[PDB]
């Protein structure tokens, strides 16, 4: 019978395993199984070579086979437990080890390994008990939208969790011509959906503009919708044929600012691919307080609305890159020329911007004429002339940078050795400039900033 050579094969293979000749052990073990498909011992010792070589997939397999093949192979359960510990299968390891020890009390024991299993599972159970830190109950838990309490005092259409109809959005723009506001359940429901989409968008936005396609780019709005009312009506409504990019600064000041983000966040749901919103540099709780936006919210709504707006706002991106050739930022240049695109993808959102590092280079850098580099203040470490940008633009293959921090006479300027440009949406921004405004027009075939001149001055 074939057992005569299976004995030699298993013997030679155990001797190869002891001699660290693992391939030869596995081959002669396989051959011993080829002569006896059902000896549980062969699958047992074969699984031990698969512990030793970390060939764990067949440690698990052949340990299971050894035990299925003989339910009374006690030392098979023991070797399965050895596989389980190597691999973290702790409950199975306890049960296998318990059985073995009660059957075989010893001094060079299975029981030190059982006590290691005991000590490990004891601490892991304690850790499962003291564990909070799955702690993220939602701002809107108990689903405040489905509490009904609908009013329609505004005669407002129902706005579903599906994309807000353009017809209402046109009506909403009319509700701003008429100083009229959304109902609360719809407003909560859009803020929930806005969170859900925005929190998944990349922290640096990447878009390819085809040669035949043109983008209109927008800057600081100071929370006045009148200017965007007009550009949407003037340059085409922000539909798929008007893939606008907005350089933030909406809660920059409060005047219609709730109403501004409330419409922008409406349009963002209907055309998310075409309509792109960045965070502005005057935008944190610190300024939401100073310019009374927090008060507008607390006047129009109970304070939990401000917690939801905080959550929603915290997901805004800082930057966008067009074709890998034009980079849109708020403030200006990075503290060093070595800043690398995947390292920008590794910037951590769900925090306030710092006064140092890439996030307040992006928001509070502030480009100069003169060559070099500034020192830490103003939400910052550094601000710049041309020289670092020559070397930065060479890393990433960029042409020039877009900024929105500073007012300029025609609504824009091309500056910084010709390697940077200005834009913003509000004409007569402040006590500080009575500027005209403009929108940059960019073609995939021609990225030299082209402009729309905006003289429609509110106030």
């Amino acid at each position: 019978g074939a057992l005569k050579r299976a004995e030699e094969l298993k013997t030679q293979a155990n001797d190869y395993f002891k001699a660290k000749d693992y391939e030869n052990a596995i081959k002669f073990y396989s051959q011993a199984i080829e002569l006896n498909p059902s000896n549980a011992i062969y699958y047992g010792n074969r699984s031990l070579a698969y512990l030793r070589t970390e060939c764990y997939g067949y440690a698990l397999g052949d340990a299971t086979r050894a035990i299925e093949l003989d339910k009374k192979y006690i030392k098979g359960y023991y070797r399965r437990a050895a596989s389980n510990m190597a691999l973290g299968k702790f409950r199975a390891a306890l049960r296998d080890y318990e059985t073995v020890v009660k059957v075989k009390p010893h001094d060079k024991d299975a029981k030190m390994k059982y006590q290691e299993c005991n000590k490990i599972v004891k601490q892991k159970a304690f850790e499962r008990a003291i564990a909070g830190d799955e702690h993220k109950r939602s701002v809107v838990d108990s689903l405040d939208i489905e509490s009904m309490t609908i009013e329609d005092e505004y005669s407002g259409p129902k706005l579903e969790d599906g994309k807000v109809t353009i017809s209402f959005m046109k009506e909403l723009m009319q509700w701003y011509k008429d100083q009229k506001k959304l109902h609360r359940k719809c407003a909560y429901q859009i803020l929930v959906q806005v969170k859900e989409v925005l929190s998944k968008l990349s922290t640096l936005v990447e878009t390819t503009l085809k040669e035949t396609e043109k983008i209109t780019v927008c800057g600081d709005t100071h929370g006045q919708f009148y200017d965007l009312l007009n550009i949407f009506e003037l340059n085409g409504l922000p539909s798929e044929t008007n893939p606008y990019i907005f350089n933030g600064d909406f809660v920059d000041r409060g005047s219609f600012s709730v109403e501004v983000i409330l419409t922008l966040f409406g349009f963002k749901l209907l055309y998310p691919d075409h309509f792109h919103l960045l965070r502005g540099n005057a935008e944190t709780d610190n300024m939401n307080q100073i310019y009374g936006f927090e008060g507008e919210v607390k006047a129009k709504y109970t304070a939990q609305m401000y917690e939801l707006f905080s959550e929603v706002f915290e997901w805004l991106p800082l930057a966008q890159c067009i074709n890998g050739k034009v980079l849109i930022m708020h403030g200006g240049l990075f503290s060093e020329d070595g800043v690398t695109l995947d390292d920008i993808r590794k910037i951590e959102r769900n925090r306030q911007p710092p006064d140092s590092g890439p996030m307040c280079d992006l928001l509070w850098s502030d480009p100069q004429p003169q060559n070099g580099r500034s020192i830490s203040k103003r939400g910052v470490s550094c601000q710049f002339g041309p020289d670092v940008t020559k070397a930065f633009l060479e890393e990433n293959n960029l042409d020039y940078i877009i900024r929105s921090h500073e007012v300029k006479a025609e609504g824009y300027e091309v500056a910084h050795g010709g390697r940077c440009v200005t834009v913003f949406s509000a004409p007569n921004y402040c006590d500080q400039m009575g500027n005209k405004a403009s929108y940059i027009h960019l073609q995939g075939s021609d990225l030299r900033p082209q402009f729309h001149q905006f003289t429609a001055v509110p106030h």
């Binding site: 004891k122 601490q123 008990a129 003291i130």
Partner: peptide
Amino acid sequence: SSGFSLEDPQTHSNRIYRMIKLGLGID
């Protein structure tokens, strides 16, 4: 849970520091 204070908060915390020591395996 019900809003009562403890007559002495130390005995209560000691029961906690014992469970913590057993859970960690300190003693």
